[PDB]
Design a protein around this ligand. Structure first.
Ligand SMILES: Cc1cc(CSCc2cc(CSCC(=O)NCCNC(=O)CCNC(=O)[C@H](O)C(C)(C)COP(=O)(O)O)no2)no1
Ligand SMILES: Cc1cc(CSCc2cc(CSCC(=O)NCCNC(=O)CCNC(=O)[C@H](O)C(C)(C)COP(=O)(O)O)no2)no1
Lengths: 316, 315
């Protein structure tokens, strides 16, 4: 029996069969405990749900599906269409998980397809991902790289201390981005960020104590979004990116794994080196707690879009 | 008689009497050579004329009045109401200079100047007092050059140790972009080093970074770029939330220019603005290496609610 949370409200349909199974859950993003959280960013006055909102639900339905048959990877995340939480009556986000398997091999299953769509009935298809019941091989490799990530972080701080790189305090960083997007205060968790613009390379302290995070989640959408904001800032805070004309927006990612809880009283270190500018850039994002590996995005992908075209799409 | 320029288009009236004189000039800010320049900044999509636009005209009518009767100080500048250059047919900015004297005209060392748009009266925008001043301030400033250069060097030393922020041109304007977007011809701040704890800034302003075609006494983009250093030093503080409160131009006590503001040259600008009534003030010096180029004394900024600013402009 799957547990309901702030971001997963009820089971719509659940069906187990010979060559597969379906699980459909529903979240009313207008419900009072979640509607504030569902409004992660505001672009041209229009609220937007963040990809981390889907990722939280994906982790929940993946963890449940796995246990009914131990890391869940939220992989192949593709965000296709904006979700605008209007807060004017029910707004039903349905998450459909499907699995396939050959006879008597249900227990071997290591992935499931997940789709996110709003309904009234069908409203919009928003996003999709593949949850993977994955090995700890990546975690083991990341643990061997900790000293290397730490050295990259130390080198960024050394360069700032010599006047080489920019260091943004929290409020100044969000001010720099404010003509592009204004954040829900509960999402404004970047305490500082050191940016080497030449390599789109950033080290950031993210402090989850800086916001309110009441509810139950698998991975708090504000905590996970704050991790991806480091990569977004590294791109859009470059002196040669004119955010009046072109901006790097979320596109999705290849892989996302969490190895330790994202604790609302703690601060974490985040490091990324995003690739150089088709219209896509990608890179990895690691999250540390001192010497411990906390989480990792592999192939986080951002897309360069015209600022005005973004505005027209959202307003329509 | 008075020369016409990009920012001063014709004489409306010129009268002398035994105890004074009046000079009224007119500028159609919709004329095609000046309308672009008149649009200095955009706030919430609404174009605004900068105080430096008035200062340029004030220098012109002051220099003229004066030679007719040798530094002009544009002093006691008060900006009361926004001027929005709509670009939809004539928009006539009238500048009125008045002098008074006891029965003695050649002794006169100041004149009152008013700036108002007419259709006839539209809006009263600003006023100042032009002063025909001594070189005492210039000579005192020349003795302080090494002290100003030391303040600038200390800011650069602090940034090189990671203590102060240094903004490249485009990143500086990006930081301010939710408050105002600038006419590219006004985006002349090449870099700025900010000590936030004292609202203290040193900036390189490079007039070659914009286009400045026309004739002026003091190019309004060049003078506005000087004041932007002080505005940035206030609004770029980490504790100023420009979504709620912003420091806007208010005016100044005194402004003198000692050397041409050359559109091929870069200059050094230094200011230490006071700590946060709703007003802050400070001095702004402009250097060309070892030479004193210009000085604002008592440049005044006013803290206003960002949304109240929006409503006022929108109406
Ligand atoms: C300090 C600090 C750090 C940062 C982060 S850097 C600046 C920044 C801000 C944001 C948030 S706003 C962009 C965003 O992606 N938000 C959520 C994602 N939500 C969607 O809804 C898009 C996907 N949607 C689409 O609609 C389409 O693909 C679209 C409209 C982009 C184009 O479609 P097409 O043109 O092909 O028709 N991110 O980075 N800030 O401060
Ligand atoms: C690098 C780098 C540098 C910068 C720029 S520096 C930061 C900055 C930018 C601005 C520009 S916008 C504010 C401004 O003052 N613009 C012109 C002045 N023009 C008026 O029209 C006010 C007139 N004042 C009024 O109308 C009223 O007094 C009002 C409405 C403000 C108050 O209302 P009241 O209460 O009196 O009714 N400024 O600083 N960027 O990157």
């Amino acid at each position: 029996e799957i547990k309901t949370t702030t971001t997963l409200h009820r089971v719509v349909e659940e069906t187990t069969k010979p060559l597969g199974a379906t699980l459909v859950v529903e979240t009313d993003i207008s419900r009072k405990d979640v509607n504030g959280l569902a409004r992660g960013h505001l672009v041209d006055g229009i609220p937007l749900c963040t990809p981390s909102f889907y990722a939280d639900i994906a982790m929940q339905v993946g963890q449940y599906s796995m246990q009914r048959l131990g890391l869940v990877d939220v992989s192949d995340m593709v965000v296709d269409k904006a979700l605008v939480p209007h807060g004017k009556g029910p707004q039903l986000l349905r998450t459909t998980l499907t699995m396939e398997w050959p006879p008597k091999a249900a227990a071997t299953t290591r992935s499931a397809k997940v789709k996110f769509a709003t309904y009234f009935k069908l409203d919009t298809e928003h996003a999709s991902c593949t949850v993977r019941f994955t090995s700890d091989a990546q975690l083991k490799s990341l643990r061997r790289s900790v000293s290397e990530y730490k050295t990259h972080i130390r080198q960024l701080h050394d360069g700032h201390a010599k006047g080489q790189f920019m260091r943004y305090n929290r409020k100044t960083g969000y001010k720099l981005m404010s003509s592009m997007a204004r954040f829900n205060p509960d999402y404004m968790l970047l305490d500082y960020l050191v940016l080497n613009e030449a390599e789109n390379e950033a080290a950031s302290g993210v402090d989850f104590s800086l916001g309110s995070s009441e509810g139950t989640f698998a991975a708090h959408p504000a905590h996970v979004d704050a991790i991806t904001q480091v990569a977004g800032f590294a791109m859009n805070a470059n002196d040669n990116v004119d955010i009046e004309k072109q901006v790097y927006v979320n596109h999705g990612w290849d892989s996302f794994q969490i190895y330790q809880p994202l604790d609302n009283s703690k601060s974490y270190q985040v490091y990324t080196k995003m690739g150089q500018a088709n219209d896509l850039v990608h890179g990895d994002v690691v999250v540390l707690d001192g010497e411990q590996i906390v989480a990792f995005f592999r192939g986080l992908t951002l897309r360069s879009v015209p600022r005005g075209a973004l505005r027209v799409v959202l307003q329509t």
